[PDB]
């Protein structure tokens, strides 16, 4: 026993405001990541090595954006296989950046806390472990994107979306997203930094401040989106009952904060241009 709330769309907000932001983000991210990859790959430290991986992870997202922008403007003309490919690439590039940030935090912990015998595990870890710990789990976490991401036709409109049997997998995968992207890497990063600051209280800062700024910017671009996801999931569980206009308000704010969070693929070349590398 529950009445339905249907989503609302208007030509002015979606079809004009979102394509422009997507285009600006696309041009900025593609130029920045192309320049960074060209300079790094074809002329270092270890943070630069991890930032090259971050740039490569950002390129996939930037590539993915010309599809969402076109879908927002006109339609989805690209078929069914490309729908799955876009979803899989988006999920991989989403999950493979926070893990690299956690690896950067671990590298800083090893470099600063020990500083006596760490070049060997730092090498081993960087070369051998990043491939088996960042990309492989990210690829494995995209099975639901392989299965449930399909294109469906209604009248003359094709939509690319994740179609689940009922509204509980949405909650399950939103909680999985929050847990994977925000908590465990967050715990690792904040514990490495707590132990570093505890170690350096009685006491290098040119790279530590840069890494701290990068991590803070990345985790501050995604926080409103995670708050919106949490509120939406607490509405789907029927723990928050505040009418039907509240749901539309939170959906609009989730859209806006997602557009804001799509700016994470430009931070790396901005901290490269401004801070001077």
């Amino acid at each position, epitope marked *: 026993m529950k009445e*339905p709330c249907f989503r609302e769309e208007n030509a002015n907000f979606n079809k004009i405001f979102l394509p422009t932001i997507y285009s600006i983000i696309f041009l900025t991210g593609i130029v920045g990541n192309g320049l960074v990859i060209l300079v790094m790959g074809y002329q270092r430290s270890m943070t630069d090595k991890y930032r090259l991986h971050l740039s490569v992870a950002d390129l996939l997202f930037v590539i993915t954006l010309p599809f969402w922008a076109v879908d927002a403007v006109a339609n989805w003309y690209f078929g069914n296989f490309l729908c799955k490919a876009v979803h899989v690439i988006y999920t991989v590039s989403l999950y493979s950046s926070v893990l690299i940030l956690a690896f950067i935090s671990l590298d800083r912990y090893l470099a600063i806390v020990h500083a006596t015998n760490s070049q060997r595990p730092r090498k081993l870890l960087a070369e051998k472990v990043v491939y088996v710990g960042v990309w492989i789990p990210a690829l494995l976490l995209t099975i639901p994107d392989f299965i449930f991401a399909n294109v469906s036709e209604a009248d003359d409109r094709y939509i690319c*979306d*994740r179609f689940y049997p009922n509204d509980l997998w949405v909650v399950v995968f939103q909680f999985q997203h929050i847990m994977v992207g925000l908590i465990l890497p967050g715990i690792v990063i904040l514990s490495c930094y707590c132990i570093i600051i505890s170690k350096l209280s009685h006491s290098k800062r040119k790279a530590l401040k840069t890494t701290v700024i990068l991590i803070l910017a990345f985790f501050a671009c995604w926080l409103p989106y995670y708050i919106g996801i949490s509120i939406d999931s607490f509405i789907l569980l029927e723990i928050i009952k505040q009418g039907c206009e509240f749901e539309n308000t939170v959906h609009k704010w989730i859209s806006i904060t997602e557009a804001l969070a799509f700016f994470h693929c430009c931070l790396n070349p901005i901290l490269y241009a401004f801070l001077g590398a």
Partner: antibody, heavy 125, light 111 residues
Framework: QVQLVQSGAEVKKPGASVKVSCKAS????????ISWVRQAPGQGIEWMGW????????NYAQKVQGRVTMTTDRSTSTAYMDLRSLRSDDTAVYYC???????????????????WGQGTTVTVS | DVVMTQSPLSLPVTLGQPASISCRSS???????????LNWFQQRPGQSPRRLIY???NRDSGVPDRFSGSGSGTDFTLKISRVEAEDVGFYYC?????????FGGGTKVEI
């Protein structure tokens, strides 16, 4: 092929109950919603209700509210409609249509009515 | 909520000559995204309704080129450029912009 198959014609006494089914095939059952409509002999087509096969959200018309209930079955991909406290005015032909679309980020109601059932004649005497 | 008025009640037409059925709504059938969702249904005797045209003037798959639709705002029209022996039946116009959907009165095309 996309199709919906209903049950047979049936005759009921006044005050009885009618449970009519609608089985969908040829498409993903949970990506759309099911709308139940009726047409009386010598009268226009009148909307009766809508049920979402995705999350079980339903809405009945004000005229028929209080006597109609709708349920779904994902395992057998079918939708039911139960009408109770029948009167002689309920003698009509009931149709089942695919109405609306309900996905993770899309939950609209202005798409559909593409495919319909063959309709069942309910005679109340 | 939204009433739809159809004209004429009965439309006797001759073979090879055009036919026009016009229906008008109580309110403006323009959605918040700028699209109008009014569609036309044809019902033969003993069969479920079959669409012809959707979104004011967009034809389905399998309908002939004779059928066409026009009008915008609160007045919409269906036209058959050449009436054939298989066009006999009932014609309805339905709007799907406001919850809930409503049907037209229905017009009987008599050969």
């Amino acid at each position: 092929q996309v199709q919906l198959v209903q049950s047979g014609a049936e005759v009921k006494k006044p005050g009885a109950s009618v449970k009519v089914s609608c089985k969908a095939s040829g498409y993903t059952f949970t990506s759309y919603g099911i709308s139940w409509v009726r047409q009386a002999p010598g009268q226009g087509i009148e909307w009766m209700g809508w049920i979402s096969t995705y999350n079980g959200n339903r809405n009945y018309a004000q005229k028929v509210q209080g006597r109609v209930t709708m349920t779904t079955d994902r395992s057998t991909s079918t939708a039911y409609m139960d009408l109770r406290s029948l009167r002689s005015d309920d003698t009509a032909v009931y149709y089942c249509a695919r109405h609306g679309i309900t996905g993770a980020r899309n939950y609209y109601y202005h798409y559909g009515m593409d495919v319909w059932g063959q309709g069942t004649t309910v005679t109340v005497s | 909520d939204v009433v739809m008025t159809q004209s004429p009640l009965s439309l006797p037409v001759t073979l090879g000559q055009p036919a026009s059925i016009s229906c008008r709504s109580s309110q403006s059938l323009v959605y918040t995204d700028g699209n109008t969702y009014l569609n036309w249904f044809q019902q033969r005797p003993g069969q479920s309704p079959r669409r012809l045209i959707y979104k004011v003037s967009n034809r389905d798959s399998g309908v002939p080129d004779r059928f066409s639709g026009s009008g915008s705002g609160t007045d919409f029209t269906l036209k058959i450029s050449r009436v054939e022996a298989e066009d006999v039946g009932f014609y309805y116009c339905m709007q799907n912009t406001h919850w809930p959907l409503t049907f037209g009165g229905g017009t009987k095309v008599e050969i």
